[PDB]
From a paper:
In this study, we focus on [name] and [name], proteins of unknown functions that localize at the kinetochore from G2 until the end of anaphase in T. brucei. Here, we discover that [name] has a pseudokinase domain in its C-terminus, which is most similar to the kinase domain of [name]. The N-terminal part of [name] interacts with [name], which we suggest to be a [name] orthologue. In this study, we propose that the kinetoplastid kinetochore proteins [name] and [name] are divergent [name]/[name] and [name] orthologues, respectively.
By screening four kinetoplastid species (T. brucei, T. cruzi, Paratrypanosoma confusum and [name]), we succeeded in determining a 2.2 Å resolution crystal structure for the C-terminal domain of the [name] protein from the prokinetoplastid [name] (clone PhF-6). [name] KKT14365−640 crystallized with two molecules in an asymmetric unit. Both molecules were essentially identical except for minor variations in flexible loops. Interestingly, a structural homology search using the distance-matrix alignment (DALI) server revealed similarity to a protein kinase fold with an N-lobe and C-lobe. The N-lobe contains a five-stranded β-sheet, a helix termed the C-helix (αC), and loops that correspond to the catalytic loop and activation loop, while the C-lobe comprises a bundle of α-helices. Although most protein kinases share a similar fold, we found that the most similar structure of [name] KKT14365−640 in the PDB database was the [name] kinase domain. Human [name] was the top hit in the DALI search with a Z-score of 15.5, while the next best hit was the MST3 kinase (Z-score 13.0). The higher structural similarity of [name] to the kinase domain of [name] rather than other kinases is owing to an N-terminal extension that is present in [name] and [name]. In the crystal structure of [name] [name], W548 (the phenylalanine equivalent of the DFG motif, which is CWD in [name] [name]), strictly conserved among kinetoplastids, faces away from the active site. Similarly, in both the crystal structure of [name] [name] and the AlphaFold2-predicted structure of T. brucei [name], the N-terminal extension makes extensive contacts with the N-lobe, which may stabilize the pseudokinase structure.
Author numbering: 367 to 640
The structure:
């Protein structure tokens, strides 16, 4: 019944492979070639998620091949890969998730493989180069994705534009959103079934100022902050969301209310990025 006992038993049981790394075989992630387990990646770009004090990498699978996102967990008992897999099971995004854990359980890594399309951080869509209609389109899909997590009662707790990724397939017809660093995420239904309360030493409780994570309030405020970080804020509507005050109880319709006012224009996205 210990919080750690149940967290571990729960996330060891999810049907996603975790590859154990042997002493000496815990890579230092950086741009260039990285080998994790038997898997080789060419990391091309370093992403600095400054609000989370973390870095992430985007590259391709060994060969000029499949797009990938690679990053280290907060720690080797974060079960981040298992948390990201559970999350993937309820989103419409084509993603293969591989978890790697040091033999000493001290370090951890996640690789996520997408189909042969294009992968962009949400941050890319917030840059002042991007036309407004493309920016709004990405945020339109994010609204759907966060509304879907809200219904499932999964709270991410560390959402930023640097750790939300937009997958665009080779046709350019749509964006498919997958947030990534899930080390601190709250599966409220899972908690309730295993009889789990928050314990005072959880980075998630210290990081926010709360004694509990109850509902999607934290994720909704995260979403609103992303609107503050639009570098060419042209929309009075987007300006409105950036300054808005979060309702004390978050419901799916709070995401719907934002989504209804955003432009969906995949042609503007396609024209500027391809």
């Amino acid at each position: 019944a210990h919080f750690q006992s149940e967290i571990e038993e729960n996330y060891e049981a999810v049907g996603n492979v975790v590859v154990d790394l042997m002493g000496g075989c815990e890579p230092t992630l950086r741009v260039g070639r990285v080998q994790l387990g038997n898997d080789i990646f060419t990391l091309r770009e370093e992403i600095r998620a400054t609000e989370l004090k973390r870095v992430l990498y985007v590259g391709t699978t060994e060969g000029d091949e499949f797009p990938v996102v690679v990053y280290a967990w907060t720690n080797g008992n974060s079960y981040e890969s298992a948390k990201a897999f559970v999350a993937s099971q309820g989103l419409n995004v084509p993603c293969r998730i591989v978890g790697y854990r040091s033999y000493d359980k001290m370090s951890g890594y996640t690789a996520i493989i997408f189909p042969q399309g294009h992968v962009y951080s949400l941050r890319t869509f917030l840059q002042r180069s991007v036309p407004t209609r493309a920016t709004e389109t990405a945020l339109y899909y994010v609204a759907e994705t966060l509304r879907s997590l809200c219904t499932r009662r999964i709270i991410h707790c560390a959402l930023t534009p640097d750790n939300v990724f937009m997958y665009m397939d080779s046709t350019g017809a749509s964006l498919k959103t997958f947030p990534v660093c899930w080390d601190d995420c709250v599966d409220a239904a899972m908690f309730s079934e295993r009889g789990l309360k928050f314990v005072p030493s959880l980075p998630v409780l210290m990081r926010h100022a709360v004694k509990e994570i109850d509902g999607s309030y934290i994720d909704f405020v995260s979403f609103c902050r992303m609107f503050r970080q639009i570098e060419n804020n042209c929309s009075a509507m987007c300006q409105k969301v950036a300054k808005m005050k979060a309702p004390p109880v978050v419901r799916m319709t709070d995401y719907t209310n934002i989504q209804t006012e955003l432009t969906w224009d995949m042609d503007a996205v396609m024209n500027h990025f391809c």
